UniProtKB/Swiss-Prot annotation, chain B:
Phosphorylated. Phosphorylation at Tyr-196 by EGFR stabilizes chromatin-associated PCNA. Changing residue 213 to I: In ATLD2; a hypomorphic mutation affecting DNA repair in response to UV; results in significantly decreased interaction with FEN1, LIG1 and ERCC5. There is a cross-link at residues 158, 239 (Glycyl lysine isopeptide (Lys-Gly) (interchain with G-Cter in SUMO2)). GO terms for cellular component: centrosome; chromatin; chromosome, telomeric region; cyclin-dependent protein kinase holoenzyme complex; extracellular exosome; male germ cell nucleus; nuclear body; nuclear lamina. This is Proliferating cell nuclear antigen. Residues 7-97 are annotated as: Interaction with NUDT15. Auxiliary protein of DNA polymerase delta and epsilon, is involved in the control of eukaryotic DNA replication by increasing the polymerase's processibility during elongation of the leading strand. Induces a robust stimulatory effect on the 3'-5' exonuclease and 3'-phosphodiesterase, but not apurinic-apyrimidinic (AP) endonuclease, APEX2 activities. Has to be loaded onto DNA in order to be able to stimulate APEX2.
UniProtKB/Swiss-Prot annotation, chains E, F:
3'-5' DNA helicase and substrate-recognition component of the SCF(FBH1) E3 ubiquitin ligase complex that plays a key role in response to stalled/damaged replication forks. Involved in genome maintenance by acting as an anti-recombinogenic helicase and preventing extensive strand exchange during homologous recombination: promotes RAD51 filament dissolution from stalled forks, thereby inhibiting homologous recombination and preventing excessive recombination. Belongs to the helicase family. UvrD subfamily. Part of the SCF (SKP1-CUL1-F-box) E3 ubiquitin-protein ligase complex SCF(FBH1) composed of CUL1, SKP1, RBX1 and FBH1. Interacts with RAD51. Interacts with RPA2. Interacts (via PIP-box and RanBP2-type zinc finger) with PCNA. This is F-box DNA helicase 1. The chain holds residues 57 to 64 of 1043 of the full protein. The lineage of its organism: Eukaryota, Metazoa, Chordata, Craniata, Vertebrata. The PIP-box mediates the interaction with PCNA. It comes from Homo sapiens. A motif (PIP-box) lies at residues 1-8. It is found in: Nucleus; Chromosome.
Length: 9, 240, 237, 244, 8, 8
């Protein structure tokens, strides 16, 4: 369930 | 074209130590305002943002914006060749030159590093909870809970912050109250991967303090101030 | 049900460091008189007997006799999470370890059902050597360079032989003293591999006591402050 | 019969430390003038010459020239059982090493199995060297280890003002400048030089650094480099490196 | 190598 | 890479 930086930035 | 002289040459050594294992290759962004580096790790779960202002350097000279693609383990190797008391000068732009001038010996080292052609907007944001705590304590919390689980739940509230992990051995909760400073506007509870945090904590020698900025469903910011020269920020995307 | 507070929490850290590589799994016998752990190693060549008296705990409450089966590697990992200046509280299917440095750490360790075992008879020993713990640590560590067995002759003499050649280390009767209490000389052979496990207890005590007699287990005894001891029994070859 | 008492036993510890990884087996030449060891490494790119003079020992007796074939890793293992302030007595089929603790009644005697070697001593002719640099040993150890990050070979260039160590590789290249100045760099030159050497051998040589605060490099064209560590007031440890 | 159970 | 016997 690890999200990634691009999804927020 | 570019000449940065740092008398506290060990700042640059500790900077590369805090990046080399997390980021293999990065573009160093050089300009009159100083040295900037921004890079995600290979998994894009974390992002490092390094800022070294021109004013923090003892001499700084830059007549054009430079984008120097650097293999950070090659740069780490060269910086290990520098002594802790050395004056380090960066110079360039197909190679980056590093000049190590002995504090008190008649010894000058000259390293010429091949570069490579390496071909995100960090939006301004407020945070619900901001925790400022000793860097060595945060390093211990992350290392200690790595023995328990792979994920840490960070719960922040007015009283303080709690780091919780769970695995086969059992469970662990580390609670800090209150130097632990908590600027809270909204309690948060987020889950992060301990493996990345244990990479961030290699920046611990740079700063006696670390600042964690957190908000609901946004990346954690792990911030190390670098003297009166800049900062090393680590962003970590949350789980769930 | 059980709660023991140890202000000198580093005792428990050193204790687990002195057991985890010799003993995989042990039962922590808990009662009103204190904490007791007795276990053989997997090869039943050595026996560990740990005693931590209730009087040595700064706070001690125990309302029933407990038998807590503990994975000592698991327990060691949690005690790694305690700082050397932390107050450690044990509390009880789970063991709760609370480390107090502001900072309070709270660990819950899964226990295991362990039904384990042996009675140690009180004995008179022909020879009792008392020596600095660090000296015994070196002697055993150094002689393992030469052979895998040591002959202890009681001054006291430690001898080993292998393919390199041989060595003899000779200690003469003198904190940093070497005292020998002997009614009869003895000469016993032991495996150095086990002795180098026993010496992991060296941080617990500035002194170690060796008790020997013909045809009986060696006793390697580390005194723990005012609160008890860690004893190692090693069967002679 | 042979008996040599070395109060500063750490000398012998350090010597074995500086030889063990470079040379597996060597013949210890014992005589009335002292202890000598000469051996090339496996690949015959380097040669070590150790001299421990008899007057450096506090007691020295030898009634017969002895040639003891020693496994240096076996001898290193035994010398690891000596404390750093122990009094070491060498005594001689087997070589006996006796360690007397400086404080506390502890005596270790070790008996080491010897072996039959047939080292065909190679003759070393002293010669005049174009350049001789004396420099702190720690500095030289720093140099060879740093540059081995960069490349597999070091170019050593000596001129009146100073000496330079240069290496190149995939990563890039490096140049270390030492200019002549206990903590000093002196250069005695009669001819400028430029030689290339394998850093992997130099990094074995620098294990002798704790024997001497200073190291002497002797260089000339078409002759092996000499890396010389002086041992107290009793001898030296010389390394000879064939140049590429 | 003897074992502990023979003596205890 | 030459060798020592080549010189001695």
């Amino acid at each position: 369930s690890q999200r990634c930086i691009p999804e927020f930035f | 074209m570019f000449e940065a002289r740092l008398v506290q040459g060990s700042i640059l050594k500790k900077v590369l130590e805090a990046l080399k294992d997390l980021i293999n290759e990065a573009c160093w962004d050089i300009s009159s305002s100083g040295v900037n580096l921004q890079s995600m790790d290979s998994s894009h779960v974390s992002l490092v943002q390094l800022t070294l202002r021109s004013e923090g350097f003892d001499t700084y000279r830059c007549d054009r914006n430079l984008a120097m693609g650097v293999n950070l383990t090659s740069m780490s190797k060269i910086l290990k060749c520098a002594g802790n008391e050395d004056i380090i000068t960066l110079r360039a732009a197909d190679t980056l030159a590093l000049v190590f001038e002995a504090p008190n010996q008649e010894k000058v080292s000259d390293y010429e590093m091949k570069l490579m052609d390496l071909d995100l907007g960090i939006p301004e944001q407020e945070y619900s909870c901001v925790v400022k705590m000793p860097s060595g304590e945060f390093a211990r919390i992350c290392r200690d809970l790595s023995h328990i689980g792979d994920a840490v739940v960070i719960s922040c509230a007015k009283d303080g912050v709690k780091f919780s992990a769970s695995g086969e051995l059992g469970n662990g909760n580390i609670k800090l109250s209150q130097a632990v400073t908590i600027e809270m506007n909204e309690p948060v509870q987020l889950t992060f991967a301990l493996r990345y945090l244990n990479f961030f904590t290699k920046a611990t020698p740079l700063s006696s303090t670390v600042t964690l900025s957190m908000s609901a469903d946004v990346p954690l910011v792990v911030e190390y101030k670098i003297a009166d020269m800049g900062h090393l920020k680590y962003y970590l995307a949350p789980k769930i």
